[PDB]
Amino acid sequence: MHPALWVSKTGLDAQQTNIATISNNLANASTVGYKKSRAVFEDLFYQNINQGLMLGAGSKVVATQKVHTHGNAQTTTNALDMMVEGDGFFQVTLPDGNIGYTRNGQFTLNGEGTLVTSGSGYPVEPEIVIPEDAISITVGTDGEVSVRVRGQQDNQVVGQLTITDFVNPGGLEPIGQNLYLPTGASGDPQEGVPGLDGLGEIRQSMLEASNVNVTEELVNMIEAQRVYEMNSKVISSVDKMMSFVNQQL
Amino acid sequence: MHPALWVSKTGLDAQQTNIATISNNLANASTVGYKKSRAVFEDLFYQNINQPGGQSSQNTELPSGLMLGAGSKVVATQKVHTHGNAQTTTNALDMMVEGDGFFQVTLPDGNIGYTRNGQFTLNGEGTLVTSGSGYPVEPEIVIPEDAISITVGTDGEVSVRVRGQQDNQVVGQLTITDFVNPGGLEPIGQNLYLPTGASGDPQEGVPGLDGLGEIRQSMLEASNVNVTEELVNMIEAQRVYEMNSKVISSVDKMMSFVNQQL
Amino acid sequence: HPALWVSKTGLDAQQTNIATISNNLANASTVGYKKSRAVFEDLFYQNINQGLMLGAGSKVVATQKVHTHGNAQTTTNALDMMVEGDGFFQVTLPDGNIGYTRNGQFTLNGEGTLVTSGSGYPVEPEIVIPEDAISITVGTDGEVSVRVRGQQDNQVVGQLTITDFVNPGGLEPIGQNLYLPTGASGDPQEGVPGLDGLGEIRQSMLEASNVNVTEELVNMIEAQRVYEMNSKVISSVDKMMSFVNQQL
Amino acid sequence: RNGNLKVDQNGMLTNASGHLVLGENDAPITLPIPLSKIEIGRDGTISVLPQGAPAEEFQAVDRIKLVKPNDQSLFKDTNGLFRHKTPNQPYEADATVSLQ
């Protein structure tokens, strides 16, 4: 048909995906440990005609880039929710048996006392089991988990948490529930003591707030809406041009 | 879409960084040995449409060229390392640097961290440690179990009094570190700084010679934040933030009008 | 149709004008910033049906920097200074040539050289603060001195100099509160900061942005309405041309 | 009258139709190859900035040949160019034509 009809349709599709990411960022404006995303645009292939004449084919959103900038800290009185001060993901065991990597720190205990996630209840690797005799839970800055036992001087150690850092956190695959899965472009899981060799430090009774810029998202909606309406006018104009021709020709 | 949209976007982001800096100073209005910070604004690049000084016709040059700005941003957060006020306390294990210098503590990873916070204490082995996470203070000062009082000299010499012995026994010597550019230190939280490339070489010595400050026992250094200044800066930050939103709103209505008309 | 593109010049002129207005409001907190006003001028005129003169529209020819001194901000930092009058601080760029700035937010590098608080460019002439200094004093004439324990009288570590230009509006802004000398700016006139028309160095003070926030808000109102007015001419011309070919 | 000028890799100044633009010496205008900023004056003067030069190194290198003959004496050729009706007649460089 008319090339302008479908070149402008690409802009409508490109902006629609752009708006979908902006709304997703605004929806997760209160999620703990959420990383905002932006839509990456790129032009389509250019065709050579009349043969040094290049015509574009439109635009598309080729990737959804996640920005893994560390968010602010929320001070909480809960003793089981923690934070990673720096680079590092908590490793949880999915029902399939593979390890999913998360940055949300809202944790709790199961019926047997194993440290699990506050949502679906997936255990945190390595397993930390809090004994019933414990009266307090302390998580050291290097993942050292210890409990205070009555009648015994000195906190006994019930486990040590480890975190995993990836060279390319943006290459992780989001699967919902604040969970990531390792991919080919993510790199290799670099596990170690949380606080040595580039790894961040565990901060107890603190939560990592969302890093979305709610002001930016509202401005991003302004330009996305106008460009979306700008492309629709070309389709309307092309529609009235083709209507004129077959009415005239 | 419109240049005014992108120019005002930088102004909105710049003010948000400015407000967060102001809020951090007010949050640490009671932190001992906290240095207030100020956001440093700078303009972005200017698009050179017409070069100033370019030759107009002949025997004439442009007195000023068409150079469109691109907005502004916060480029630095400058720590003002001026000395704070002194709080008198009855504790014998909280000290203050009377002048330039930083206490040195041992971080868990092995590196030496530098602190202006003097709230120290002892651990189960008698070593002088910080009152927070418990990091030991470099060099180690072990207080013997036979001590009846603790005296920390102006020159940093720590001595303890023992019953049955005149001339209180010396148990160690504290050394503080100064930096040419203390504002170049990297604040890692917990009232601790790490040396950086622009921080300068750590110069260590006795606290009171070579420009180093003196150690004041039973004294704490209050934060240097000006609570009134932060409130006035919050007023300026709020209004400039809102006036950039007016420009974006106006551009939004302008493009809405063009879509309905053209 | 000429009316289509005559009004397009008006739309382009207002778009450039609004961009400069947004730049002024964005830099309402930048230290040592000079506001700018777009300069409008009508395009050439055509003598048609020859004694009938028709304009070609309008455009923005230049952006004029208004170099009026801003207000004073009192700070407790001992390294941020302000020029009380006419003059620029001169810094060394990575290219080796000297850039000129009005923002006086300075600091020290690892070696003690006085550098800018942003990228870290050294300030010309070099001032080096010894490690034994306990306080830094900058006189009203750029005389920088430091206090050394055990020695009466502040020793002098150097003297700052400032540069003045006959036409500061002709300087070429390159961002980062920096300017580059151009042909129309004039010849850089260095000298002692406080003699021969040069301003005075004010330590622990900063020069505020000189923008007028109320003026820019009103300028937005007048720029937006003229932008909308030229859109209706294009819309009306479109309706006229759509009417002629439909009717004929 | 098409002033959609462009500079190729060799530095020769042409227009969008591919025609070589003449200069003050009646020859095609060839600019220095590594430019950094090109300014056309209101009279045809071409001032260029060598790459990496300071802003105070703008220099005029050529002047676009502008002609104002009698319009009644011009005819359009087979390739869209207006030429003198009388052959073998030169084109005087008028100093009154201005470029916006």
Side-chain angles (χ1 to χ4, degrees), chain A residues 203 213 215-216 226 233, chain B residues 13 16 190 241 252 259 262:
Chain A
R203 290 281 174 257
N213 203 131
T215 297
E216 275 189 351
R226 296 315 171 190
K233 297 210 306 177
Chain B
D13 203 332
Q16 284 185 308
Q190 296 176 336
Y241 179 92
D252 170 61
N259 294 12
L262 273 61

Side-chain angles (χ1 to χ4, degrees), chain B residues 91-97 102-105 115-122 127-132 135-138 174 192 215 220:
Chain B
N91 213 124
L93 284 181
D94 46 352
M95 291 88 75
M96 178 190 178
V97 183
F102 287 88
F103 294 114
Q104 18 185 345
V105 313
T115 170
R116 262 284 192 164
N117 194 332
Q119 302 192 241
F120 295 141
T121 180
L122 309 178
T127 304
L128 188 70
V129 302
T130 64
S131 185
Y135 302 151
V137 176
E138 269 268 351
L174 283 176
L192 291 171
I215 305 301
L220 290 177

Side-chain angles (χ1 to χ4, degrees), chain B residues 2 7 15 36 38 40 42-44 46 51-52 62-64 66 69 71-72 76 180-181 198 203 210 236 257 261, chain C residues 15 22-23 26-27 29 33 62-65 73 75-76 105 107-108 110 131-132 167 170 172 175-177 184 235:
Chain B
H2 193 254
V7 171
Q15 288 297 332
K36 63 166 172 293
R38 168 163 182 169
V40 176
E42 74 174 17
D43 25 321
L44 295 180
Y46 285 74
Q51 170 75 239
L62 274 66
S64 60
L66 183 64
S72 65
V180 192
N181 178 239
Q203 45 177 119
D210 196 64
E236 177 207 4
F257 187 84
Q261 289 282 156
Chain C
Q15 172 171 157
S22 57
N23 185 84
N27 310 33
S29 300
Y33 178 83
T63 312
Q64 172 64 23
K65 282 273 188 175
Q73 311 185 211
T75 65
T76 182
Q105 292 190 283
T107 181
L108 305 186
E131 305 199 299
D132 293 19
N167 179 245
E172 175 186 358
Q176 303 189 280
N177 317 121
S235 179

